[PDB]
Amino acid sequence: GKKLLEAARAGRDDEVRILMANGADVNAADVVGWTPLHLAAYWGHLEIVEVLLKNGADVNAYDTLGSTPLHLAAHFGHLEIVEVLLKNGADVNAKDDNGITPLHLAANRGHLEIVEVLLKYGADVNAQDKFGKTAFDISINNGNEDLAEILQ
Amino acid sequence: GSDLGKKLLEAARAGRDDEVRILMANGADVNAADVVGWTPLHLAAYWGHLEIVEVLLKNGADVNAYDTLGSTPLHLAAHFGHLEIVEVLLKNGADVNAKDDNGITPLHLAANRGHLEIVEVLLKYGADVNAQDKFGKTAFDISINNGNEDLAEILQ
Amino acid sequence: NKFQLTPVDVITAIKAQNAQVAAGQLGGTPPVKGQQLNASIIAQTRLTSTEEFGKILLKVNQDGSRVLLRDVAKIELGGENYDIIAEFNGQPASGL
Amino acid sequence: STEEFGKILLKVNQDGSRVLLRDVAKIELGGENYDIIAEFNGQPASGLGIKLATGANALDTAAAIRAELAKMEPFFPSGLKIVYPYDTTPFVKISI
Amino acid sequence: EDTPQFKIDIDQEKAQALGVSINDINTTLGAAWGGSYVNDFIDRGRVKKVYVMSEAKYRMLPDDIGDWYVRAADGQMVPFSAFSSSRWEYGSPRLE
Amino acid sequence: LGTATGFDFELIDQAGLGHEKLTQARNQLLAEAAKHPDMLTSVRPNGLEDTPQFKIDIDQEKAQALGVSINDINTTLGAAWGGSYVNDFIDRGRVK
Amino acid sequence: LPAGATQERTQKVLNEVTHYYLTKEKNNVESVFAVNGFGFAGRGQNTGIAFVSLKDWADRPGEENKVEAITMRATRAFSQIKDAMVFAFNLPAIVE
Amino acid sequence: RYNGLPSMEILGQAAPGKSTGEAMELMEQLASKLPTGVGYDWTGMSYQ
Amino acid sequence: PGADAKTVQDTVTQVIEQNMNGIDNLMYMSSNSDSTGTVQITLTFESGTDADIAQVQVQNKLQLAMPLLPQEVQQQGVSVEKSSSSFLMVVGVINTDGTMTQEDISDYVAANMKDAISRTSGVGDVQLFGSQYAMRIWMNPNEL
Amino acid sequence: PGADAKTVQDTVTQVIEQNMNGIDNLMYMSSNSDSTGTVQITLTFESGTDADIAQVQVQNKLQLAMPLLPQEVQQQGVSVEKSSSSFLMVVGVINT
Numbered sequence A: 001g002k003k004l005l006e007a008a009r010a011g012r013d014d015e016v017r018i019l020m021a022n023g024a025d026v027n028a029a030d031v032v033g034w035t036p037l038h039l040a041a042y043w044g045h046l047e048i049v050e051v052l053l054k055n056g057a058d059v060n061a062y063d064t065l066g067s068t069p070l071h072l073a074a075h076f077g078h079l080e081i082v083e084v085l086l087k088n089g090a091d092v093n094a095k096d097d098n099g100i101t102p103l104h105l106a107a108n109r110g111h112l113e114i115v116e117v118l119l120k121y122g123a124d125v126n127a128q129d130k131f132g133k134t135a136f137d138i139s140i141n142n143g144n145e146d147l148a149e150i151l152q
Numbered sequence B: 001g002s003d004l005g006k007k008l009l010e011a012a013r014a015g016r017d018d019e020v021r022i023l024m025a026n027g028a029d030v031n032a033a034d035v036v037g038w039t040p041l042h043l044a045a046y047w048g049h050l051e052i053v054e055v056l057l058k059n060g061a062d063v064n065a066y067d068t069l070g071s072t073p074l075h076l077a078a079h080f081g082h083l084e085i086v087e088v089l090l091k092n093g094a095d096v097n098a099k100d101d102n103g104i105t106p107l108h109l110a111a112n113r114g115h116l117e118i119v120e121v122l123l124k125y126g127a128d129v130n131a132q133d134k135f136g137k138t139a140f141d142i143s144i145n146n147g148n149e150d151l152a153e154i155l156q
Numbered sequence C: 001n002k003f004q005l006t007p008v009d010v011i012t013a014i015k016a017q018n019a020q021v022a023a024g025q026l027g028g029t030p031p032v033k034g035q036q037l038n039a040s041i042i043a044q045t046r047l048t049s050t051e052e053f054g055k056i057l058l059k060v061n062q063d064g065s066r067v068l069l070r071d072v073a074k075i076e077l078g079g080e081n082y083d084i085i086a087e088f089n090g091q092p093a094s095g096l
Numbered sequence D: 001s002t003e004e005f006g007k008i009l010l011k012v013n014q015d016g017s018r019v020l021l022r023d024v025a026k027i028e029l030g031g032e033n034y035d036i037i038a039e040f041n042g043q044p045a046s047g048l049g050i051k052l053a054t055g056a057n058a059l060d061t062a063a064a065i066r067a068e069l070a071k072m073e074p075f076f077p078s079g080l081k082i083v084y085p086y087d088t089t090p091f092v093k094i095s096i
Numbered sequence E: 001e002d003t004p005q006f007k008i009d010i011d012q013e014k015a016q017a018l019g020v021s022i023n024d025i026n027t028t029l030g031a032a033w034g035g036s037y038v039n040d041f042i043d044r045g046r047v048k049k050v051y052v053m054s055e056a057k058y059r060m061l062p063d064d065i066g067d068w069y070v071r072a073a074d075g076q077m078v079p080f081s082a083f084s085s086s087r088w089e090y091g092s093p094r095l096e
Numbered sequence F: 001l002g003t004a005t006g007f008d009f010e011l012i013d014q015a016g017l018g019h020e021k022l023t024q025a026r027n028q029l030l031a032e033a034a035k036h037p038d039m040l041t042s043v044r045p046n047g048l049e050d051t052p053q054f055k056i057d058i059d060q061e062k063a064q065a066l067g068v069s070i071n072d073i074n075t076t077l078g079a080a081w082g083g084s085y086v087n088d089f090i091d092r093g094r095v096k
Numbered sequence G: 001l002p003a004g005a006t007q008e009r010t011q012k013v014l015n016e017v018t019h020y021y022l023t024k025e026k027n028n029v030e031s032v033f034a035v036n037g038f039g040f041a042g043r044g045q046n047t048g049i050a051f052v053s054l055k056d057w058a059d060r061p062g063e064e065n066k067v068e069a070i071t072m073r074a075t076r077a078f079s080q081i082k083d084a085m086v087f088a089f090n091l092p093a094i095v096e
Numbered sequence H: 001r002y003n004g005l006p007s008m009e010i011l012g013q014a015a016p017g018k019s020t021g022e023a024m025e026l027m028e029q030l031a032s033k034l035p036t037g038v039g040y041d042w043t044g045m046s047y048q
Numbered sequence I: 001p002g003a004d005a006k007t008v009q010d011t012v013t014q015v016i017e018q019n020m021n022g023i024d025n026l027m028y029m030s031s032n033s034d035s036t037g038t039v040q041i042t043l044t045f046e047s048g049t050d051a052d053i054a055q056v057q058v059q060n061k062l063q064l065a066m067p068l069l070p071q072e073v074q075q076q077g078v079s080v081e082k083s084s085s086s087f088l089m090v091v092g093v094i095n096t097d098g099t100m101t102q103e104d105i106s107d108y109v110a111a112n113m114k115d116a117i118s119r120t121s122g123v124g125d126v127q128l129f130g131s132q133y134a135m136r137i138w139m140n141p142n143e144l
Numbered sequence J: 001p002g003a004d005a006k007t008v009q010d011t012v013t014q015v016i017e018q019n020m021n022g023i024d025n026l027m028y029m030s031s032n033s034d035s036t037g038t039v040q041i042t043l044t045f046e047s048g049t050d051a052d053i054a055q056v057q058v059q060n061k062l063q064l065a066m067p068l069l070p071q072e073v074q075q076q077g078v079s080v081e082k083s084s085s086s087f088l089m090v091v092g093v094i095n096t
């Protein structure tokens, strides 16, 4: 289990198998509540993300701050991982404890392709965070016009 | 203020009992005061020289001499924890309730420094437990501000 | 002037919003025994780009209108000073 | 003293009650930091890790350290004792 | 190796709206969770330091962050949860 | 070189005894020395005896009630009674 | 230990190291001075160091009782400690 | 202060016909009988 | 105090490093910035370099950086030492009547022994295995 | 300016003394703190010590302690000089 958390982070693809093939808990969570899927998502390990979801990883697992692997993938611009997670039922409108969505994160970091996908999956453009901000408010504050036009 | 006055002030402060004895024999002014108004008795009381305190009082020292800010030898003895000096002074007429110019009394001072035995002696001799300094404080106020639970009990 | 601001306000906002804060730790020493988590707390970090400087917030107006640093200034990377300009055979250069 | 810090006056309430430091804080003598904790053969200890100045003589410096230590011992609180758990100099002396 | 660190963003807009100064926020966070060397005192004749810091049980868990209040210019007590957001991330404990 | 026959001795507070106890120890040593006129002569302190000083206590509570700051109290007292170096000016070309 | 590891877990590992010297190397090890929170530079909750002093050479006859074999046996035994790097080693003839 | 500790310097001299070494030996003797926590050292010309 | 590795590096380490030039006989320079809030910069010199002068030169440069460092860093005291990396010896202190705890022993060592050892010629650096006492004010957010 | 001996000792003298470490060939150190608001610390070195090196090492350790000193002392400055007692001559200047 703890071995799985480490292998997923290091992107050890086989290793993830040897463990996935010895029944290590696929939703083992570390001290901050990150699952192997959080780690693969964060460190951009696409193959490992797929293997984990294959073996029934909780796609909407959330850490001790309400954050999901989708939040992570979107925030760090991992476009393909974002696609896969959504495919596998990632709540596109998941809010962390701050009322922050994957769209807020992608918009903040100016990830355009990613923003599109999230929208192509029903991301609520009007979703407000705890401060009342939308992605659009973000794109404007950042002075990102390409992104601003999209959200309209 | 005289040759012998000066020497008496020095000898009392230094606790030189023999010198004081000789000075008493020679008529050294027991009422000599320095610039701040301290008598040999003030000095002896401050520095804790019991024998000299007793010798001075036998030689007509003013037990209630006050300095330029209105402080007495009992104030000093009570403040610096000199229990037996405190007892001697009170035996010899020391005003247990003397207030200096700040309206501070020997009780305030013993309290402030947590000198329990001295506090009890003072109360024994009629120390006014309700006396207030210029700021309206009593010895009890002082003890709760200091967080001295025991002393605060004594002062119920 | 139009926004009723001065260089003092600009300077103050930059100090406040371009900052690197020592913020402590969770589970730092001395801890409550049995603590499992030890982690740095990361608060504000230095800005890294013109865009970040541009969106420094100078003030919000009574009507919730926002005044950003880029509304009162041009933001760009440029020499610490502009005093020395070199050329090598008539072509733009630097050197040591 | 902790007692004196305890009575630092933070504010006087409206009713005239006082707020002292000890009312909003525990006050104690304790380490500047709580990161380093040593033991000697399993019992509580402290100590000094000493490094030679560049180019200095190891044997002379060790002798100087011991001489300085001997000046301190007679004034130790009861029970305090110096121990010698790690010294690189005896080997030099002994090997020569 | 990199490790989890707790990232907290102070919302400039919100602090301005509430009238809480950024300096008060950062001093409160820093002193409480990091400790602050205030000034010196004399311990048994020797100069030594005075440190303010949160008691351990209040700086052990992420949710403790919101139990700290800053005073706004209008006198109102405002919890950290009103003007900040946080998330986990990775960072280096030792940069070479 | 001082004098031949002369010695130069230091009495030391090795255990946080404080000024008054050091003084008493000193006097104790001086009285004993004086009992050995056959060996020791003119054994005396090189420094200064204690003297009257004027202790003034600020009442923190009263200052707070009156709305008077300690900084103002302390610089008012120090500046007036002790003097204060404010800054520099230029007198016929020289900084003073 | 990895960063994120607590002082408490570092102590557990230090206790295991100390234990091994006090029980398995009784005949060779005179003392162990173990420090939690300090390592080959610098501080940290997740680091520590043991200084070990051997009995005199005359009481350690045989290759097997010299520092090389001792540190090799120790490192091997310590390899079976979880989520820690623990290495016993002799300092080289010369620094660089 | 002397060597970073509170101190009080004491000057004096050997009596006639006495060596400074003798005077110093005695001072050390006298100093051995002082209240707990009081030490001493030699400085300046005596240090040499 | 309280700073993370990155804050230390970008607020102290880089500032000092950028000022490290015009130093004779420098072979190389390395540094660590850690989340204990600590920085160590090591400048290594040609064999035969006079350590006294190396130290003087380094500090002439450090002093140009000092004003640019955070006030809290300046008040902790920055130090410049010229010592071997390894320990000469460790002086241990214990209490055999067990009437002083580890914290008490460390404070005694800090307050009564360490300074004189540190001032002894040939002593390049002294590490206290423990901490000197400070007045600790442990705040309670509820009461505040 | 305006300081008494204890104020001088406890805010300047002790702080400087505590920083006089890592200086070569020190025999001893002594100091006076007095009610004229003055401190003098004298460090005396082994015969044969290069006086210039001795002085620069002291001055460099002082430099690093300056931020620990009171503002008004940092402002007056702290002189590090070589000690001499011999004048070639004293020229007096009088008005008649």
Ligand SMILES: COc1cccc2c1C(=O)c1c(O)c3c(c(O)c1C2=O)C[C@@](O)(C(=O)CO)C[C@@H]3O[C@H]1C[C@H](N)[C@H](O)[C@H](C)O1
Pocket (backbone or CB within 6 Å): G039, G040, G041, G042, G047, I085
């Ligand atoms: C033939 O050398 C080696 C061969 C294999 C492994 C090793 C080494 C080795 O020399 C080494 C070390 O020197 C050090 C360490 C270490 O793990 C090894 C090896 O594993 C650990 C260390 O970095 C710490 O973590 C201290 O807290 C300390 C120390 O660093 C020393 C020397 C370093 N290079 C560093 O730059 C500094 C001089 O202190």
Ligand SMILES: COc1cccc2c1C(=O)c1c(O)c3c(c(O)c1C2=O)C[C@@](O)(C(=O)CO)C[C@@H]3O[C@H]1C[C@H](N)[C@H](O)[C@H](C)O1
Pocket (backbone or CB within 6 Å): G040, G071, G087, G088, G089, G090, G092, G095, I085, I086
């Ligand atoms: C200025 O030197 C140091 C200063 C501080 C710490 C260190 C060192 C140091 O030199 C050092 C080492 O040389 C070694 C190690 C080490 O921790 C340090 C320091 O911490 C540990 C080690 O066993 C490993 O980590 C292997 O993975 C390797 C190595 O052991 C060395 C010596 C052994 N007896 C043997 O020769 C081995 C092959 O290399």
Ligand SMILES: CCCCCCCCCCCCO[C@@H]1O[C@H](CO)[C@@H](O[C@H]2O[C@H](CO)[C@@H](O)[C@H](O)[C@H]2O)[C@H](O)[C@H]1O
Pocket (backbone or CB within 6 Å): D093, D094, D095, G056, G057, G058
């Ligand atoms: C017939 C000639 C025999 C020897 C003559 C030598 C004369 C003067 C020698 C100068 C130094 C002597 O040092 C010689 O080795 C060490 C010194 O650490 C001493 O004693 C040694 O005993 C054992 C091993 O024998 C060591 O582990 C130990 O560390 C060491 O103390 C010896 O008892 C002494 O003889």
